[PDB]
Design a protein around this ligand. Structure first.
Ligand SMILES: NC[C@@H]1O[C@H](O[C@H]2[C@@H](O)[C@H](O[C@@H]3[C@@H](O)[C@H](N)C[C@H](N)[C@H]3O[C@H]3O[C@H](CO)[C@@H](O)[C@H](O)[C@H]3N)O[C@@H]2CO)[C@H](N)[C@@H](O)[C@@H]1O
Ligand SMILES: NC[C@@H]1O[C@H](O[C@H]2[C@@H](O)[C@H](O[C@@H]3[C@@H](O)[C@H](N)C[C@H](N)[C@H]3O[C@H]3O[C@H](CO)[C@@H](O)[C@H](O)[C@H]3N)O[C@@H]2CO)[C@H](N)[C@@H](O)[C@@H]1O
Ligand SMILES: NC[C@@H]1O[C@H](O[C@H]2[C@@H](O)[C@H](O[C@@H]3[C@@H](O)[C@H](N)C[C@H](N)[C@H]3O[C@H]3O[C@H](CO)[C@@H](O)[C@H](O)[C@H]3N)O[C@@H]2CO)[C@H](N)[C@@H](O)[C@@H]1O
Ligand SMILES: NC[C@@H]1O[C@H](O[C@H]2[C@@H](O)[C@H](O[C@@H]3[C@@H](O)[C@H](N)C[C@H](N)[C@H]3O[C@H]3O[C@H](CO)[C@@H](O)[C@H](O)[C@H]3N)O[C@@H]2CO)[C@H](N)[C@@H](O)[C@@H]1O
Ligand SMILES: [Mg+2]
Ligand SMILES: [Mg+2]
Ligand SMILES: [Mg+2]
Ligand SMILES: [Mg+2]
Ligand SMILES: [Mg+2]
Ligand SMILES: [Mg+2]
Ligand SMILES: [Mg+2]
Ligand SMILES: [Mg+2]
Ligand SMILES: [Mg+2]
Ligand SMILES: [Mg+2]
Ligand SMILES: [Mg+2]
Ligand SMILES: [Mg+2]
Ligand SMILES: [Mg+2]
Ligand SMILES: [Mg+2]
Ligand SMILES: [Mg+2]
Ligand SMILES: [Mg+2]
Ligand SMILES: [Mg+2]
Ligand SMILES: [Mg+2]
Ligand SMILES: [Mg+2]
Ligand SMILES: [Mg+2]
Ligand SMILES: [Mg+2]
Ligand SMILES: [Mg+2]
Ligand SMILES: [Mg+2]
Ligand SMILES: [Mg+2]
Ligand SMILES: [Mg+2]
Ligand SMILES: [Mg+2]
Ligand SMILES: [Mg+2]
Ligand SMILES: [Mg+2]
Ligand SMILES: [Mg+2]
Ligand SMILES: [Mg+2]
Ligand SMILES: [Mg+2]
Ligand SMILES: [Mg+2]
Ligand SMILES: [Mg+2]
Ligand SMILES: [Mg+2]
Ligand SMILES: [Mg+2]
Ligand SMILES: [Mg+2]
Ligand SMILES: [Mg+2]
Ligand SMILES: [Mg+2]
Ligand SMILES: [Mg+2]
Ligand SMILES: [Mg+2]
Ligand SMILES: [Mg+2]
Ligand SMILES: [Mg+2]
Ligand SMILES: [Mg+2]
Ligand SMILES: [Mg+2]
Ligand SMILES: [Mg+2]
Ligand SMILES: [Mg+2]
Ligand SMILES: [Mg+2]
Ligand SMILES: [Mg+2]
Ligand SMILES: [Mg+2]
Ligand SMILES: [Mg+2]
Lengths: 88, 117, 101, 73
RNA sequence: GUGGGAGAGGGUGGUGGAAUUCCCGGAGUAGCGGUGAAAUGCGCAGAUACCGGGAGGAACGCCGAUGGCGAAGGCAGCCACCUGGUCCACCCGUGACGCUGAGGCGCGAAAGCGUGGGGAGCAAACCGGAUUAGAUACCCGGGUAGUCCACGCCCUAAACGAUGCGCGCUAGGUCUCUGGGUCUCCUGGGGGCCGAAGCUAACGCGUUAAGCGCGCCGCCUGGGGAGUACGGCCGCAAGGC
């Protein structure tokens, strides 16, 4: 699954300032983690459609968050994309 | 020709018949009777009366092997399972016990349309 | 890593050398799959509700253990190979749940 | 009917997850191997639901019967 | 975000017992089976009933509910791994990041199709026995596809709550599943029943609205002709839109 240490690791890694949990950068980091993990699972288990729905939703949420970021702060957005390796 | 004297009475009661098989304590048949073994032929084999006769018959035949006591095992629901048991009870055989062994599935095998619903 | 309970039911007909031999392969394969043993209850042979491989009784071992999760199924697979090994059940440990407490 | 007693009322405290306690578990099975309903076990939903699984484990282990012959009759 | 919880939610690999069928063996003999009554059928190459051993396939009794989960179709032995959703508490972080959603994409019961397996039980078609005025049926005996698996198609339905999704507002009572709290009580989430106001042609609905409101989507416009014809698109086909 995802252990508290892996999670906290990426939370600190992407947090805007100390104590930052729910900022856009962090949320997108977390979501990217879960996506990579879940699409990894669905690499095998191509027959698990129910989980694929999950994936769809997670991607949708992520894409919304990024849309908002790129609207507000094109810098923070560019940074995020590069750092995580998304969108290209 | 054995001289057994203690054994098992298996009553197999269906809606079409009753078959009373009597065996030695290891389950090997000694004698058996049924609805059709007495004169009854058609539907009449499924009668409680036919069951009484089949019981009494198997028990006579079995006492001729010198049997005294039996353990009764009842398989199936059907008219005259109980009549069979009772005929056995005073057949002039001591019935030491009665047990309902009726096999039922943990749901493995699809029934004929007759039995589905 | 996660903590499981291992149940093994063995042949009641084992003499001392046979039984302790089996336990030896148990231990060695447990280690070989990376299972550290936290606790053990050997409850000896006991009566069964039904015959297991023609036998009216069985010999029960229990192990509380910590091991890698990716290894569990494969461990139990290996455990089962032994002929004298009749039953194997590996269970994720859980905190006891009481009624009338 | 079922006014005899409730199986939980007899017992003291005990671990409903404990698949090895045979004597306690046996109390929750009928004359046949069948798991008693709650109207008998006098358990709660969650409880009963746990009981069932642990009984099933005990059955696989050979400690409890899946089924049993009915005596008397 | 942190910390708790319930669950037939999903995928993979394991594995357990009951039963059916079959094969072997023992013991046993004159029938079994089946129906309204029967006959076909099975049985002296020894059936049925009984015990022991084996093989395989399929489905998981009790628990089991008026229950739970899932967007829907749907999901039920037990075990492990992998994985989706969700609820409660703390009030910690971001700061309108929201709702809906043509087209697109994906999922989609059963039956059906392709390749290759599998095939115990059941069983369209089919072969028979009855019933009947007839009986291309109901009932009885057999029985192929199929039902099972893998992979790829099909895209339908009384796919139903026949009730689009989101949010706010408008008495209570009662049962239940599942959280939390100063645990008789108070406070969330879910499933039922009776009912205030109100609505409804009526039946009924009524904080799980079919009440009062706002947003966005889909649809309707007398019955037959007809889900037909034509055209297009999809499909191996059946056929679908
Ligand atoms: N692949 C598994 C599935 O098997 C299905 O097969 C199942 C269906 O044909 C049928 O389901 C019926 C259902 O129609 C009806 N509404 C109620 C009935 N209790 C169900 O049956 C089921 O009930 C329970 C739970 O599984 C079990 O105890 C029972 O063994 C099972 N037959 O019983 C079968 C065995 O469960 C279908 N082929 C399909 O859904 C799918 O392929
Ligand atoms: N047992 C593992 C299961 O396998 C399922 O799929 C597998 C099982 O259905 C089946 O495995 C074996 C089969 O190889 C072998 N030829 C026969 C055996 N009876 C099967 O097992 C299964 O078959 C069916 C399920 O359809 C059940 O009736 C039966 O109880 C069950 N043991 O064949 C499939 C491929 O191995 C699913 N992955 C999931 O339910 C689960 O992991
Ligand atoms: N769902 C499968 C089964 O669920 C049970 O265990 C599952 C649930 O009890 C448990 O629920 C936990 C919850 O306790 C905890 N407070 C939060 C957690 N997110 C939940 O887990 C849930 O969400 C995550 C995604 O984060 C999913 O990966 C997971 O499948 C889902 N159950 O997560 C477990 C994993 O799914 C059964 N006891 C077990 O046999 C089996 O894992
Ligand atoms: N594998 C061959 C044998 O198939 C048998 O069963 C197979 C055949 O009896 C059956 O025939 C199917 C038919 O059902 C279905 N309605 C249509 C399908 N095209 C047919 O298939 C047939 O025809 C085609 C070409 O015409 C061939 O390529 C194919 O090999 C042949 N089976 O399809 C089955 C497989 O799905 C035995 N059960 C199996 O044990 C055995 O192995
Ligand atoms: Mg967890
Ligand atoms: Mg959402
Ligand atoms: Mg700006
Ligand atoms: Mg008859
Ligand atoms: Mg295992
Ligand atoms: Mg599941
Ligand atoms: Mg068998
Ligand atoms: Mg034989
Ligand atoms: Mg003949
Ligand atoms: Mg022959
Ligand atoms: Mg023998
Ligand atoms: Mg046998
Ligand atoms: Mg629902
Ligand atoms: Mg339904
Ligand atoms: Mg705040
Ligand atoms: Mg909050
Ligand atoms: Mg601020
Ligand atoms: Mg939407
Ligand atoms: Mg797309
Ligand atoms: Mg489909
Ligand atoms: Mg199908
Ligand atoms: Mg096919
Ligand atoms: Mg099959
Ligand atoms: Mg048939
Ligand atoms: Mg006919
Ligand atoms: Mg007529
Ligand atoms: Mg006709
Ligand atoms: Mg005719
Ligand atoms: Mg025939
Ligand atoms: Mg037929
Ligand atoms: Mg569509
Ligand atoms: Mg409906
Ligand atoms: Mg409703
Ligand atoms: Mg509903
Ligand atoms: Mg939404
Ligand atoms: Mg409490
Ligand atoms: Mg529901
Ligand atoms: Mg009124
Ligand atoms: Mg009115
Ligand atoms: Mg009405
Ligand atoms: Mg009402
Ligand atoms: Mg409520
Ligand atoms: Mg329309
Ligand atoms: Mg339309
Ligand atoms: Mg018109
Ligand atoms: Mg017109
Ligand atoms: Mg049509
Ligand atoms: Mg056309
Ligand atoms: Mg074409
Ligand atoms: Mg055409």
């Amino acid at each position: 699954p995802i252990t508290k240490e892996e999670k906290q690791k990426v939370i600190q890694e992407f947090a805007r300032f100390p104590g930052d949990t729910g900022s856009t950068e962090v949320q997108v980091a977390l979501l990217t983690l879960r996506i990579n993990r879940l699409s990894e699972h669905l690499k095998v288990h191509k027959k698990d459609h129910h989980s694929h729905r999950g994936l769809l939703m997670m991607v949708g949420q992520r894409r919304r968050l990024l849309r908002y970021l790129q609207r507000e702060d094109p810098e923070r957005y560019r940074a995020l994309i590069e750092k995580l390796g998304i969108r290209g | 020709k054995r001289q057994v004297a203690s054994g098992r009475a298996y009553i197999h009661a269906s809606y079409n018949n009753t078959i009373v098989t009597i065996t030695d304590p290891d389950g090997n048949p000694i004698t058996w009777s049924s609805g059709g073994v007495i004169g009854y032929k058609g539907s009449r084999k499924g009668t409680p009366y036919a069951a009484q006769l089949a019981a009494l018959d198997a028990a006579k035949k079995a006492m001729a092997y010198g049997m005294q006591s039996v353990d009764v095992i009842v398989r199936g629901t059907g008219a005259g399972r109980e009549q069979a048991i009772r005929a056995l009870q005073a057949s002039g055989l001591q019935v030491k016990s009665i047990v309902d062994d009726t096999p039922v599935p943990h749901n493995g095998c699809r029934p004929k349309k007759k039995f589905r619903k | 890593m996660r903590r499981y309970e291992v149940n093994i039911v063995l042949n009641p007909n084992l003499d001392q050398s046979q039984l302790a031999l089996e336990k030896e392969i148990i231990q060695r394969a447990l280690e070989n799959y990376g299972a550290r043993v936290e606790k053990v209850e050997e409850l000896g042979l006991r009566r069964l509700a039904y015959p297991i491989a023609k036998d009216p009784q069985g010999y029960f071992l229990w192990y509380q253990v910590e091991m890698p999760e990716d290894r569990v199924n494969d461990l139990a697979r290996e455990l089962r190979i032994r002929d004298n090994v009749r039953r194997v059940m590996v269970v994720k440990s859980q905190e006891p749940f009481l009624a009338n407490a | 009917p079922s006014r005899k007693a409730k199986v939980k009322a007899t017992l003291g405290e005990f671990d409903l997850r404990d698949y090895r306690n045979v004597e306690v578990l046996k109390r929750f099975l009928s004359e046949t191997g069948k798991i008693l309903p709650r109207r008998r076990t006098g358990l709660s939903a969650k409880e009963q639901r746990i009981l069932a699984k642990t009984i099933k484990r005990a059955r696989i282990l050979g400690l409890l019967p899946f089924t049993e012959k009915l005596v008397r009759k």
